[PDB]
């Protein structure tokens, strides 16, 4: 619903979604070639399936293609400084792809707006919605459009005849963070097949050991997981599968 939906937010009005209590799968996106650019900072996307994060933030927007370079840590641009600013120590990355077939119109798709003028460069990860008229003269414009009273918001001319730099590009930025809180977001790990009646090195749910695992005839309780003997001897029963 975030990677490919019917409505994506604007660059200046980007949409934030919180991903938590999710079992994410980063292998499918790594293998998918439908995305134009996907390269990430701090953590290699190959090993994203291993690291577990407490919460993830996905911000979706549609920008100009030539502007996809501006969306990076320590980058200076127009939409970078006035619409979406990234922190220098940003953890995560963006996934961007050309979307001229959906986000452009024959007469020009004018539903996408971006801010050109504002008081000063905004802090990273800040949302601006106010459409106050940017005044450049000494006299107060009184919020009335006219001379020397510029409108900061302007619409992109998305047309199929434009170049690849001017084609609309759908970008979803994934940001990962951790703090003194339990982590919940990570992959499904892996479960190799089980073999019986053979001396094996087992790892059940984070408990490791060596021994032979035979079929057993004993009754547990639904919530019970491990097994024990008269002195701290593990007899694991509950298969995680």
């Amino acid at each position: 619903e975030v990677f490919n939906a019917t409505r994506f937010a604007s660059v200046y009005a980007w949409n934030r979604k919180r991903i938590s209590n999710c079992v994410a799968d980063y292998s499918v996106l790594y293998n998918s070639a439908s995305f134009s650019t996907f390269k990430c900072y701090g953590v290699s996307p190959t090993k994203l399936n291993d690291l577990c994060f407490t919460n993830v933030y996905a911000d979706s927007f549609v920008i100009r293609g030539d502007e996809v370079r501006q969306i990076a840590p320590g980058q200076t641009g127009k939409i970078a400084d006035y619409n979406y600013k990234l922190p220098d120590d940003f953890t995560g990355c963006v996934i961007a792809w050309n979307s001229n077939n959906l986000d452009s119109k024959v007469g020009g798709n004018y539903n996408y707006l971006y801010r050109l003028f504002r008081k000063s460069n905004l802090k990273p990860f800040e949302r601006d919605i106010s459409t106050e008229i940017y005044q450049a003269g000494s006299t107060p414009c009184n919020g009335v459009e006219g001379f020397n009273c510029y409108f900061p918001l302007q619409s992109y001319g998305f047309q199929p005849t434009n170049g690849v730099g001017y084609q609309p590009y759908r970008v979803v930025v994934l940001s990962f963070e951790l703090l003194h809180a339990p982590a919940t977001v990570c992959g499904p790990k892996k479960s190799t097949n089980l073999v019986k009646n053979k001396c094996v090195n087992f790892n059940f749910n984070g408990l490791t050991g060596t021994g032979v695992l035979t079929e057993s005839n004993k009754k547990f309780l639904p919530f019970q997981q491990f097994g024990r003997d008269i002195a701290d001897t593990t007899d694991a029963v509950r298969d995680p599968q």
Partner: antibody
Amino acid sequence: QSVEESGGRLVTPGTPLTLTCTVSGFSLSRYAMSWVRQAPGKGLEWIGIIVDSGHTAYASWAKGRFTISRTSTTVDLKMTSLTTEDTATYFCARETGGGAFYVFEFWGPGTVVTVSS
Amino acid sequence: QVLTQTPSSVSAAVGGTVTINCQASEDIYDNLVWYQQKPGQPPKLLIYDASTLAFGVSSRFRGSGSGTHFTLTMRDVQCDDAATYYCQGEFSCSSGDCTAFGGGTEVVVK
């Protein structure tokens, strides 16, 4: 990839004339053909472009009196209400690859359209 | 909407260098190309994206610039470089007239 064109003739003002560009060695449905012209000894002028999908773009100075059409192997351009200042040389130019519009790496030999009595 | 090329004409010796400036009335990012038109020959694209040398062209031609100012410099100009050069850049869309061509410059080597 060879791009050629023809249609040069001497015509009176106000007489419509069509010029046909023939491609060879590539697929037209993937690549954008465009029309440019230059006056004798003067600078280059842009006429229009047709994308591979089929959408059309023109120039403001043209005022909207050109018409560029596409088919199997003939990118044709037609004119109406010729004036005496349209005596120039016309070319059809190809692109580099998918997308990357307005590059014009391959050009036609060149044909001259003259308007006089 | 307006592309400007300076100077209109300039000459230099064989063992010399010259520069050409192309200015755009609007921000065009780096989407700018150059051409060389010999007398009677169709133009050949020399540099595209204002910093990438085209296939089959020499390394004595270099391009730089970004935004609204671009510069093409030729080093050790030979007698074969005597031709006309033009700059072209994409100009947004609906706002302006798609693309436009520059006025061009003439180079002659003594």
